[PDB]
Design an enzyme around this catalytic site. Structure first.
Site, PDB file in Angstrom:
ATOM      1  N   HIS A  53      68.410  27.193 -22.466  1.00 16.31           N
ATOM      2  CA  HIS A  53      68.733  28.608 -22.316  1.00 16.31           C
ATOM      3  C   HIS A  53      69.803  29.081 -23.302  1.00 16.31           C
ATOM      4  O   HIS A  53      69.779  30.236 -23.762  1.00 16.31           O
ATOM      5  CB  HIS A  53      69.164  28.952 -20.881  1.00 16.31           C
ATOM      6  N   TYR A  60      56.866  29.498 -25.760  1.00 15.07           N
ATOM      7  CA  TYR A  60      58.311  29.670 -25.972  1.00 15.07           C
ATOM      8  C   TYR A  60      58.753  29.863 -27.450  1.00 15.07           C
ATOM      9  O   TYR A  60      59.925  30.143 -27.735  1.00 15.07           O
ATOM     10  CB  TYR A  60      59.094  28.558 -25.264  1.00 15.07           C
ATOM     11  N   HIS A  82      60.647  22.068 -24.088  1.00 13.61           N
ATOM     12  CA  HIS A  82      59.257  22.515 -23.976  1.00 13.61           C
ATOM     13  C   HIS A  82      58.286  21.762 -24.875  1.00 13.61           C
ATOM     14  O   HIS A  82      57.080  22.030 -24.830  1.00 13.61           O
ATOM     15  CB  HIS A  82      59.154  24.023 -24.218  1.00 13.61           C
TER      16      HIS A  82
HETATM   17  C1  LIG Z   1      67.455  22.081 -21.769  1.00 15.30           C
HETATM   18  C2  LIG Z   1      66.114  22.511 -21.182  1.00 15.30           C
HETATM   19  O1  LIG Z   1      65.406  21.277 -20.957  1.00 15.30           O
HETATM   20  N1  LIG Z   1      66.416  23.379 -20.058  1.00 15.30           N
HETATM   21  C3  LIG Z   1      65.441  23.639 -19.007  1.00 15.30           C
HETATM   22  C4  LIG Z   1      64.938  25.078 -19.012  1.00 15.30           C
HETATM   23  O2  LIG Z   1      64.166  25.322 -20.192  1.00 15.30           O
HETATM   24  C5  LIG Z   1      64.088  25.323 -17.769  1.00 15.30           C
HETATM   25  O3  LIG Z   1      63.811  26.713 -17.645  1.00 15.30           O
HETATM   26  C6  LIG Z   1      62.418  26.992 -17.783  1.00 15.30           C
HETATM   27  O4  LIG Z   1      62.171  27.323 -19.153  1.00 15.30           O
HETATM   28  C7  LIG Z   1      62.622  28.660 -19.477  1.00 15.30           C
HETATM   29  C8  LIG Z   1      62.973  28.878 -20.850  1.00 15.30           C
HETATM   30  O5  LIG Z   1      63.342  27.842 -21.447  1.00 15.30           O
HETATM   31  O6  LIG Z   1      62.880  30.042 -21.305  1.00 15.30           O
HETATM   32  C9  LIG Z   1      62.729  29.677 -18.606  1.00 15.30           C
HETATM   33  C10 LIG Z   1      62.640  29.475 -17.117  1.00 15.30           C
HETATM   34  O7  LIG Z   1      63.991  29.527 -16.655  1.00 15.30           O
HETATM   35  C11 LIG Z   1      61.955  28.130 -16.848  1.00 15.30           C
HETATM   36  O8  LIG Z   1      60.528  28.263 -16.966  1.00 15.30           O
HETATM   37  C12 LIG Z   1      64.845  24.905 -16.506  1.00 15.30           C
HETATM   38  C13 LIG Z   1      64.059  25.304 -15.245  1.00 15.30           C
HETATM   39  O9  LIG Z   1      64.558  24.555 -14.138  1.00 15.30           O
HETATM   40  O10 LIG Z   1      65.147  23.506 -16.581  1.00 15.30           O
HETATM   41  C14 LIG Z   1      65.983  23.086 -17.680  1.00 15.30           C
HETATM   42  O11 LIG Z   1      67.355  23.436 -17.406  1.00 15.30           O
END
Ligand SMILES: CC(=O)N[C@@H]1[C@@H](O)[C@H](O[C@@H]2OC(C(=O)O)=C[C@H](O)[C@H]2O)[C@@H](CO)O[C@@H]1O
Ligand code: ZN
EC number: 4.2.2.7
Length: 747
Positions: free
Chosen positions: A177, A232, A381
């Site tokens: 994020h 993404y 991702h």
């Molecule tokens: C560091 C990375 O592995 N963090 C993860 C987040 O990507 C993940 O959140 C999902 O992906 C995204 C995004 O990257 O835009 C958005 C949404 O919040 C989620 O679909 C979270 C979700 O638990 O885990 C990790 O922290």
């Protein structure tokens, strides 16, 4: 775009720009203020402004959701839109009153705003901050002193709620994020705004950006691709580009490697004729809504004056509401556009990717083929998919299986940890060590597990399958997954007859293997009836013969297996492609060909099925797939070779090409149609003389790989045919034409 005019100073050995002592300096400088009047009168931007004024009305009370998502704030409405448009109006009219209204309309609510915990709320909070920063910088000279203190303190209070923390020392700088809006747009934009009163914020936000985010992005940028998958790519590349524009408009020029321009060409090459995009990394599927990269095409297109990207944006010139203001300020309406119809049919992405995208056209009849080494893994991702191939033609044939969301859940789902992100989901190679463990304690944000399933695939790098903080940490760790050995396409650059790629992917796996290599050779057969093929040749050496080896081919519909032949068809959703694989190695006596799939077995991983059914009405073509083909050796051995030849055509094509295996001393190869392709028998460099025989009518095109670069000599039937040809270092290959007879190659 302008030339940098700010002062730079090293901070902890890193050169960073210093915000100019002048307002405006957020999203624009004084220099471009008088040019707003014309953008107002540019009709293409008229609608954009009209749209923003419509956005001024409040949420009708009964339509407010109650669960206030990031989706709710990004759909921006009401007061915050109004003050932005007042502040803009203040730049355009210089009118003390117009500027003072903006300041007092926003200030109370900025210091009071509360934000209920909800999905990715930091996005909301961050956009609120932007709203504040706009008024602050755009109306700086109308601010009272007490007001600046009030604003500074409001901003710090809002910062402390952002996920990355304040100070922003949390989460990750390459993915995650913190690689999104919070720092590259939101925190940066405020820091720039309040620099005269509270420089610490900029010093922290831009501190981390230039020290971490930037360094890690410049490192992979020269190869013109992104690592977060084809969905993404949108948010992540968008935020890179917000940093680009912000800092350039601050006066710092382009801080990124200009190769950034060519990153989004990868999306263009992946566009199917059905409006969809070739799959990769965490994605979902649809046949209802064509996918666009609207914001990236806008920002990158307009900044780099690129007509191929601009056309991309023009497909769907509709930006999310919270970005409409950035369209208005930064969109280039003068810039032209071109269809991709005249681009070369293959594109190569070098270190640290090692990826080929290969095409046979740009129209309805196009074959689209992807070949991937993966030198490093970025996690988040990205999937552990070293060596994977993917083939679409009139529908997805050789698929990148599974789906991001569904009955299993989302990012944190069992399906993500145990199938989707793992090797087993991909057209790659498995080597099963019954005693291997896969540490996952750091994966995801919910439902944590110490370990994930054993899919016989590639390692889960990192400290329990989390991304490293930054490039330095990455390189010192265990994120290296392979090495590009050789690559090329030709002989013509525009319409290459072949596309070649070879990678050592050994590091993707545990000590269970001593050597893993994959050589892809895609042929554009320049022929309507059977337009393409792909030869894949693999070398697998295990630390223990009893570790079961697998070669995998995923499909949507059930494959038919008839001897050494695998036939996969699309018969649904208007697709009608066909893939047919000829299994040459291992030969029929040492080869087990087996399909696994159907209800209960679509996401099967050694004894457990990681169910992921679509939410009703979604993924209507079932591109998450339902079946895979497994090829295993009957005989246990440390070293095995796979050689498979794929052909692409309409599922109504009766007669295809006959595939002959070519066996020489030192080499192993394939002849089909008028193409001859050879590899080193051991898949190691050939540096002594070698040979083989060609039997068949007409002229053949020869691609011999794995050669020691230098000057080779080519004989046929005992006599000199080509006294001297050169194998070059990038591809280690010879290319030439020749008719039937018995060949020798000297070096
Ligand atoms: C560091 C990375 O592995 N963090 C993860 C987040 O990507 C993940 O959140 C999902 O992906 C995204 C995004 O990257 O835009 C958005 C949404 O919040 C989620 O679909 C979270 C979700 O638990 O885990 C990790 O922290
Ligand atoms: Zn995948």
């Amino acid at each position: 775009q302008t030339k940098a005019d700010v002062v730079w100073k090293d901070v902890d050995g890193v050169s960073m720009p210093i915000p100019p002592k002048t307002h405006p300096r957020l999203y624009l400088r004084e220099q471009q203020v008088p040019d707003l009047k014309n953008r107002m009168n540019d009709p293409k931007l008229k609608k954009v402004w009209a749209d923003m004024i419509k956005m001024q009305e409040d949420w009708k009370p009964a339509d407010i959701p109650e669960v206030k998502d990031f989706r709710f704030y990004f759909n921006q409405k009401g007061l915050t839109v109004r003050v932005e448009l007042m502040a803009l109006n203040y730049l355009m009219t210089k009118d003390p009153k117009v500027g003072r209204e903006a300041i007092t309309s926003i200030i109370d609510t900025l210091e009071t705003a509360t934000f209920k915990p909800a999905g990715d709320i930091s996005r909301g909070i961050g956009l609120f901050m932007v709203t504040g920063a706009i008024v602050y910088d755009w109306c700086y000279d109308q601010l009272k002193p007490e007001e600046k203190t009030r604003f500074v303190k409001a901003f710090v209070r809002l910062a402390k709620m952002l996920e990355c923390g304040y100070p922003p020392v949390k989460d990750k700088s390459i993915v995650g994020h913190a690689s999104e809006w919070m720092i590259m747009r939101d925190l940066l934009s405020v820091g720039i705004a309040i620099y005269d009163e509270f420089p610490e914020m900029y010093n922290l936000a831009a501190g981390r950006f230039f020290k971490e985010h930037l360094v890690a992005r410049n490192w992979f940028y020269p190869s013109h691709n992104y690592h977060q998958g084809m969905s993404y790519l949108n948010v992540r590349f968008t935020n890179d580009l917000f940093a680009l524009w912000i800092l350039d408009r601050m006066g710092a020029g382009n801080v990124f490697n200009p190769g950034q321009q060519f990153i989004l060409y990868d999306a263009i090459y992946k566009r199917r004729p059905d409006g969809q995009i070739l799959a990769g990394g965490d994605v979902d599927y649809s046949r209802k809504k064509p996918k666009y990269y609207t914001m990236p095409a806008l920002l990158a297109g307009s900044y780099y004056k690129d007509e191929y990207l601009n056309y991309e944006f023009l497909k769907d010139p509709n930006v999310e509401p919270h970005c409409k203001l950035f369209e208005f300020l930064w969109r280039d309406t003068q810039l032209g556009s071109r269809k991709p119809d005249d681009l070369p049919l293959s594109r190569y992405s070098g270190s640290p990717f090692g990826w080929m995208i290969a095409r046979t056209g740009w129209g309805p009849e196009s074959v689209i083929a992807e070949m991937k080494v993966n030198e490093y893994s970025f996690l988040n991702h990205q999937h552990q998919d070293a060596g994977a191939f993917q083939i679409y033609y009139k529908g997805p044939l050789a698929i990148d299986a599974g789906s991001y969301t569904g009955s299993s859940g989302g990012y944190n789902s069992p399906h993500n940890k145990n199938f989707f992100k793992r090797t087993i989901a991909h057209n790659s190679l498995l080597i099963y060590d019954p005693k291997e463990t896969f540490s996952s304690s750091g994966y995801g944000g919910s439902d944590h597990t110490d370990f994930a399933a054993n899919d016989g695939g590639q390692r889960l790098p990192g400290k329990g399958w989390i991304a490293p903080r930054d490039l330095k940490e990455m390189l010192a760790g265990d994120f290296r997954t392979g090495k590009i050995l050789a690559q090329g396409f030709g002989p013509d650059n525009q319409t290459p007859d072949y596309t070649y790629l070879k990678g050592d992917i050994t590091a993707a796996y545990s000590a269970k293997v001593k050597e893993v290599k994959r050589s892809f050779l895609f042929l554009n057969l320049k022929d309507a009836k059977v337009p393409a093929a792909m030869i894949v040749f693999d070398k697998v050496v295990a630390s223990n013969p009893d570790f079961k080896k697998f070669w995998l081919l995923h499909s949507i519909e059930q494959p038919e297996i008839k001897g050494n032949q695998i036939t996969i068809k699309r018969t649904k959703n208007g697709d009608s492609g066909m893939l047919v694989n000829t299994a040459l190695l291992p030969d029929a006596a040492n080869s087990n060909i087996t399909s696994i799939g159907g209800k209960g077995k679509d996401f099967w991983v050694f004894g457990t099925n990681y169910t992921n059914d679509p939410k009703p009405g979604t993924d209507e073509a079932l591109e998450r797939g339902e079946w895979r083909v497994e090829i295993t050796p009957k005989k246990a051995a440390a070293e095995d070779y796979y050689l498979n030849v794929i052909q692409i055509a309409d599922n109504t094509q009766q007669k295809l090409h006959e595939v002959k295996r070519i066996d020489g001393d030192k080499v192993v190869g394939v002849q089909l149609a008028d193409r001859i392709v050879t590899f080193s028998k051991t898949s190691e460099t050939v540096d002594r003389p070698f040979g083989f025989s060609v039997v068949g009518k007409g002229t053949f095109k020869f691609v011999m790989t794995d050669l020691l670069p230098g000057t080779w000599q080519v004989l046929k039937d005992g006599k000199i045919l080509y006294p001297a040809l050169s194998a070059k270092g990038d591809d280690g290959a010879l290319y030439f034409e020749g008719t039937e007879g018995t060949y020798r190659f000297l070096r």
